[PDB]
Amino acid sequence: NTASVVVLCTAPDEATAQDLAAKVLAEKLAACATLIPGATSLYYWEGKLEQEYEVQMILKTTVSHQQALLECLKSHHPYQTPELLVLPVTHGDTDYLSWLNASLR
């Protein structure tokens, strides 16, 4: 029984976000994906301010599967450079955690 972690990744739209989630679930690299639509990203690129629609993905997994999950997401990105960050979890519901660990075989 398994420490958890929350992985944030950005997708350009709902269909991409959905398909991504499906794949990493199928591979048992995450137990649950949460997808938040409607977001805007702003950032400079090559000297210009960009403003883009996004879906914020929130992926729940254990510290044992974190590197492979990260590897998988980076493999699917068109330029192998996903906006991908890991936040530490300092506590779960231990029953939800039991399910999370069980889901990952």
Residue 72 touching a copy of itself (CB under 8 A): no
Residue 76 touching a copy of itself (CB under 8 A): no
**One symbol per residue from 13 to 42: x for binding Hg ion (CB under 5 A), - otherwise; what is it?**
-------------------x--------x-
Kindly tell me which residue out of 16, 25, 76, 101 binds a copy of itself, with binding defined by CB under 8 A. 25
Shortest distance (Å) from residue 64 CB to a copy of itself: 14
At residue 79, φ and ψ (nearest 5 deg) are: -120, 15
Kindly tell me which residue out of 2, 54, 76, 101 binds a copy of itself, with binding defined by CB under 8 A. 54
Residue 85 touching a copy of itself (CB under 8 A): yes
* Residue 81: both structure tokens together: 């450079």
- Evaluate whether 12 touches 52 at the Cβ level (below 8 Å): yes
Hey, is 34 helix, strand or coil?
strand
CA distances from 65 to 42, 98, 104 (A): 30, 15, 8
In whole angstroms, what is the distance from residue 48 CA to residue 98 CA?
A: 47
The residue among 3 and 103 lying less far from Hg ion, judged by its C-beta, is 103
